[PDB]
Amino acid sequence: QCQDVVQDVPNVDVQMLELYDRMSFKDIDGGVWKQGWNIKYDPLKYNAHHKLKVFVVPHSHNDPGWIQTFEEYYQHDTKHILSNALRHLHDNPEMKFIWAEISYFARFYHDLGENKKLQMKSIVKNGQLEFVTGGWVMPDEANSHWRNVLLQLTEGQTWLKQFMNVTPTASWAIDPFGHSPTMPYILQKSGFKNMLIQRTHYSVKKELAQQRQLEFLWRQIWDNKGDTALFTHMMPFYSYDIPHTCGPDPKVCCQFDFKRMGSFGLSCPWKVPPRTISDQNVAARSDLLVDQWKKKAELYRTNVLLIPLGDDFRFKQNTEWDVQRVNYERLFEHINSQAHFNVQAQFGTLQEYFDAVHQAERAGQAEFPTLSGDFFTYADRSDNYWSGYYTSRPYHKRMDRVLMHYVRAAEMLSAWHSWDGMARIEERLEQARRELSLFQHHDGITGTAKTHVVVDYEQRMQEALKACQMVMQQSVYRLLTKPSIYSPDFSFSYFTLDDSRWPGSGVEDSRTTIILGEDILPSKHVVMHNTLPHWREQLVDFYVSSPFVSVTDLANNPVEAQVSPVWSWHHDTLTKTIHPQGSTTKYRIIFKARVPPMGLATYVLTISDSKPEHTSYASNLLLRKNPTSLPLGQYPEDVKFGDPREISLRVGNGPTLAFSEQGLLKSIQLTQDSPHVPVHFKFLKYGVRSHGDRSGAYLFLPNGPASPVELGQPVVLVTKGKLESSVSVGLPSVVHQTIMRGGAPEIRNLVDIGSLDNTEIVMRLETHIDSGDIFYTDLNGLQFIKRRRLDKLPLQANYYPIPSGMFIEDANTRLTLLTGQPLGGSSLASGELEIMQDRRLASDDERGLGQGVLDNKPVLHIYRLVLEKVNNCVRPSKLHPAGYLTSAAHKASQSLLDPLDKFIFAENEWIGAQGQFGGDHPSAREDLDVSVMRRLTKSSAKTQRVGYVLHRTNLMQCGTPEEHTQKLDVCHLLPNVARCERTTLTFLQNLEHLDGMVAPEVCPMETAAYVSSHSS
């Protein structure tokens, strides 16, 4: 049935980790093709019965924000490009054009008059204008979560289906900075047949070109059978621009970019300009151009050649359309009429190219190699590895993951009902999806845009968060109020969201205090939501105006609680120390919430005049020389003081953690009898080179290994409670916190790099684990890939994206660090893990951004740290390119990315309140998630439709007996099901009509989509 993703090592022609081990990566001058060799071809290869078919594919790369905002580019460039494409393609039936970015296209189309909409639909229907990929954006592939890659793909393609009646099956990704196999994974499950990529390491292009392995069937690293494979074309040269797309010699190709003759303010840096094609020069010009084409064709296996013709924001001016088209038409007429060339050249689209390639394949002309692996870390030249953008602008990288979750929760909570149009649910959800989708752009989440553009993305995301909050709180009010009492005002805030980790303590004072008092309000209802499809317990905290608060469930059962102070860290500009101050009027109450699968649970907080029976109070110990008093108002336990010292803590039956006198972890002891395993946190700094190339938003070019941050004698705060304990320390640039709740600790870093120019702050873990040169990092939150540190490459080449987690292991022990935000990281020595926190860079790094990164702001990074024994786990063999999490590590990752949501009832009394929603929802096996639940129809549809994306991960078997869980059938989650269909992941095509209206669960590492239809 299901493929075994652990025990069967796939047999592929190219496995990227193996290729990396063998490659020497020498950076030699290849001649005119600087990173290749002088290509030779046999002129007799092509003849009358075997011609070279050349497709020249006009394109225009349009960034949804980079050096200008989305709206600035739309007004100055993109609207003109699309208007002139419409005119020119209409008037010139053989001209072609491809378009990728649907965020821009949708904007443009909705502003067109009906006559022009109709003209536009006609040039799409007739194949002159072709959509490629059809996502909202062309996303980053390093930092993006797979859930958001799917979200933006779906946003663009849903628009295209509705308005253009087309769904692209070929993908075009010419600009992301390195490439991930998560893309073919999602695309192949969304109807695609082909994809194109460009930015891969120059040494990889050379190696694959030598073997004609630039076109390959790209399968997942664990896929033994090959069912995931997607045909992939990798472009061979340094850029997608015209000089690097006609052939190997850019001095020649630049002469065929007819926008470079002077009047457009462009020129050829190789110092030979284009010349207008005429009858007196066409034979000579054609002989140069065809020679470049035949050289490029040597790198590929069929007689069908792809020649992109475009660059950034091209095809704007009418005069530009004319100059490119007329000159190429003259070349085509000459070349195609001169038999000695044995070439047929024409304008074409991307799909036309791929169709012709597969026709050649089926005619027996070519067989294609199989490939697995990824294409990180990219370098475009010399030692310029693009690992900096794995960290750049980390505040917005963290915001991405918060908004990811809020979009999921808003779509899920509101999916349970149909809503009247006056509720503006669909409106707010569309806004949220579109702003999050926009940020997936390869200058958004990457942190590679100008400062004012970053500000625009942030503002858009804030509006999206507010939209999600509105939808979430309206939904909770409807789900938990007696139906005959429910009386909604769709503009009113029935609940406010309380989020403890965004923007976070020390970043924004954004959270509301629950204000209780005998003379104002005795009690307050709070509600937790659990988006995951299994019962979940999690500690939750709220701010309250008294320490004398107790918690009950709605059946009035007492719930054990802990009260702790509200501590804020202050950079004291008088004493020159970083130290905590406690509130004397706000307090934190903490208790364990238990919430049904995809459900809600209500609790009540009640004030009393004295310490409640079921509430305890944490102790607090401030470790520093030269302490001063720390009053805490009504808080019943006095703060204690001491000189810095080592300390040890244990919460519940969980691990015992030991800390240095500097407040940093030194060891973890898993159980009572077990060893104190050395696990040391350390903060270090990288700098920038004083000669040669400088680090910037894209490039990490360190001036050697990192140097320790000088810590001085930092102030350490120890809070010890029955439910939660923590150690926090004010270090230079980081308030570092280790929080213990009875399992793997949570780490929070409040990172403020301040004015430290040309500094990158790294957090490192040092252990004994005999990992050697092996470590594992994830791709897009979807899969873990084996990495091998290569000392033959520079330090920055050994940095990889850490979009959600990383681990090291030996035969016996594993250490996994899970993240709540994408950051860059590595293992630079056996037993180590490290992850960059922020970077502040004064210089531009010559990739067009035209600024350094000097707009840092405080960010709260979150993590879980899981030390485990793995000697009993069934792991892949030494040759398998994947790794897999344990149950504990996977749940830890879910605790960061999809925590419980917390709602505080706004008014004094909630009439008709109910205690729970979803108690009857199936509690699915732990490896299964309902990644997306989305109602697909508005309230006017007679047949309601609800879409589900189901993802099953793969967890290691380590000898923990499986407990019976319930089968999850998403098609019966809503009543009155009339049909259940398996669909593509975008919901746009029905693939299977399902027997008995039952949606089967999916196999390990598989993702499926289902749509249920309800007659209601």
Point out the residues that are catalytic: 175
DSSP conformation letters of 409-437: HHHHHHHTS---GGG-HHHHHHHHHHHHH
Interface residue with ligand HN2 among 245, 392, 448, 895 (CB under 6 A) is 448
Distance CA 805, CA 816 (A): 7
Partner touching 689 among ligand NAG, ligand HN2, Zn ion, none, CB below 5 to 8 Å by kind? none
- Residue 445 backbone class (left: φ over 0; alpha: ψ -120 to 50; beta: rest): alpha
Which distant-in-sequence residues (6+ apart) come within 8 Å of 939 by Cβ? Answer: 418, 419, 420, 421
Taking CB under 6 A as the rule, does residue 916 contact ligand HN2? no
How far the first Cα of the chain sits from its last, in Å, is 35
- Residue 31 backbone class (left: φ over 0; alpha: ψ -120 to 50; beta: rest): left
In contact, 452 and 69? CB cutoff 8 Å: yes
Where do the DSSP E strands lie in 263-324? 304-312
C-beta closer to ligand HN2: residue 442 or 814: 442
- Considering CB under 6 A, how many residues would be counted as binding ligand HN2? 10
Residues at the binding site for Zn(2+) are 61, 63, 175, 442
Distance CA 296, CA 299 (A): 6
Taking CB under 6 A as the rule, does residue 126 contact ligand NAG? no
* Tokens found for residue 940: 């006017």
132 phi/psi in degrees, rounded to 5: -120, 130
- Residue 733 backbone class (left: φ over 0; alpha: ψ -120 to 50; beta: rest): left
CB of 338 to ligand HN2, least distance (A): 37
CB of 174 to Zn ion, least distance (A): 8
- What does the DSSP 8-state code read for residue 841? B
User: Whose CB is nearest to ligand NAG?
Assistant: 165
Which range, of 61-69, 349-357, 555-563, 742-750, touches Zn ion by CB under 5 A?
Answer: 61-69
Taking CB under 6 A as the rule, does residue 315 contact ligand HN2? no
User: Whose CB is nearest to ligand HN2?
Assistant: 848
CB of 268 to ligand HN2, least distance (A): 15
Distances (CA, A) of 147 to 111, 400, 931: 30, 11, 7
C-beta closer to ligand HN2: residue 137 or 999: 137
Partner touching 847 among Zn ion, ligand NAG, ligand HN2, none, CB below 5 to 8 Å by kind? ligand HN2
Taking CB under 6 A as the rule, does residue 972 contact ligand HN2? no
The pattern of x and - marking residues 15 through 54 that bind Zn ion according to CB under 5 A reads: ----------------------------------------
CB of 175 to ligand HN2, least distance (A): 5
Distance CA 522, CA 800 (A): 52
Taking CB under 6 A as the rule, does residue 77 contact ligand HN2? no
Evaluated on CA atoms 206, 207, 212, 215, the torsion sign reads negative
Side-chain half-sphere CA neighbours of 55 within 13 A: 20
C-beta closer to Zn ion: residue 71 or 907: 71
Taking CB under 6 A as the rule, does residue 848 contact ligand HN2? yes
Which distant-in-sequence residues (6+ apart) come within 8 Å of 669 by Cβ? Answer: 655, 656, 657, 658, 675, 676, 677
Task: Look up tokens 């284009």; give the residue.
Answer: 274
Three-state DSSP class for residue 467: helix
C-beta closer to ligand HN2: residue 77 or 981: 77
CB of 149 to ligand HN2, least distance (A): 17
Taking CB under 5 A as the rule, does residue 77 contact Zn ion? no
CB of 243 to ligand HN2, least distance (A): 12
The pattern of x and - marking residues 174 through 213 that bind Zn ion according to CB under 5 A reads: -x--------------------------------------
Partner touching 652 among Zn ion, ligand NAG, ligand HN2, none, CB below 5 to 8 Å by kind? none
**Residue of 565, 526, 527, 568 whose CA lies nearest to 546:** 565
312 phi/psi in degrees, rounded to 5: -65, 130
Geometric angle at alpha carbon 681, from 676 and 686, rounded to 5°: 155
In contact, 243 and 286? CB cutoff 8 Å: no
CB of 988 to ligand NAG, least distance (A): 12
C-beta closer to ligand HN2: residue 443 or 838: 443
CB of 256 to ligand HN2, least distance (A): 20
Distance CA 111, CA 331 (A): 37
In contact, 620 and 565? CB cutoff 8 Å: yes
C-beta closer to ligand HN2: residue 174 or 823: 174
DSSP conformation letters of 490-534: TTS-SEEEE-STTTTTTT---PPEE--BTTTBSEEEEEEEE-SSS
**Residue of 147, 889, 928 whose CA lies nearest to 534:** 928
C-beta closer to ligand HN2: residue 241 or 898: 241
C-beta closer to Zn ion: residue 6 or 174: 174
Which range, of 60-68, 255-263, 460-468, 954-962, touches ligand HN2 by CB under 6 A?
Answer: 60-68
Partner touching 620 among Zn ion, ligand NAG, ligand HN2, none, CB below 5 to 8 Å by kind? none
Which range, of 184-192, 364-372, 440-448, 686-694, touches ligand HN2 by CB under 6 A?
Answer: 440-448
**Residue of 406, 169, 185, 162 whose CA lies nearest to 936:** 162
Partner touching 165 among ligand HN2, Zn ion, ligand NAG, none, CB below 5 to 8 Å by kind? ligand NAG
Residue type present at position 913: A
Which range, of 23-31, 59-67, 222-230, 369-377, touches ligand HN2 by CB under 6 A?
Answer: 59-67
Which range, of 332-340, 442-450, 822-830, 990-998, touches ligand HN2 by CB under 6 A?
Answer: 442-450
Taking CB under 6 A as the rule, does residue 175 contact ligand HN2? yes
Interface residue with ligand HN2 among 77, 241, 443, 901 (CB under 6 A) is 443
Q: Prior bond to 168 cis, omega within 30?
A: no
C-beta closer to Zn ion: residue 310 or 947: 310
Interface residue with Zn ion among 25, 59, 63, 852 (CB under 5 A) is 63
Interface residue with ligand NAG among 75, 165, 575, 908 (CB under 6 A) is 165
Taking CB under 6 A as the rule, does residue 764 contact ligand HN2? no
CB of 442 to ligand HN2, least distance (A): 6
Taking CB under 6 A as the rule, does residue 141 contact ligand HN2? no
Residues at the binding site are 61, 63, 175, 442
Taking CB under 6 A as the rule, does residue 312 contact ligand HN2? yes
**Residue of 517, 403, 520 whose CA lies nearest to 467:** 403
- What does the DSSP 8-state code read for residue 202? H
- Considering CB under 6 A, how many residues would be counted as binding ligand NAG? 2
Which distant-in-sequence residues (6+ apart) come within 8 Å of 309 by Cβ? Answer: 56, 57, 58, 59, 242, 245, 324, 328
CB of 166 to ligand NAG, least distance (A): 8
C-beta closer to ligand HN2: residue 311 or 400: 311
Geometric angle at alpha carbon 262, from 259 and 265, rounded to 5°: 80
CB of 244 to ligand HN2, least distance (A): 11
C-beta closer to Zn ion: residue 104 or 884: 104
Taking CB under 5 A as the rule, does residue 141 contact Zn ion? no
Taking CB under 6 A as the rule, does residue 278 contact ligand NAG? no
Contact set with ligand NAG (CB under 6 A)? 125, 165
Residues in contact with Zn ion by the rule CB under 5 A: 63, 175
Residues that bind ligand HN2 (CB under 6 A): 61, 63, 66, 175, 312, 442-443, 448, 847-848
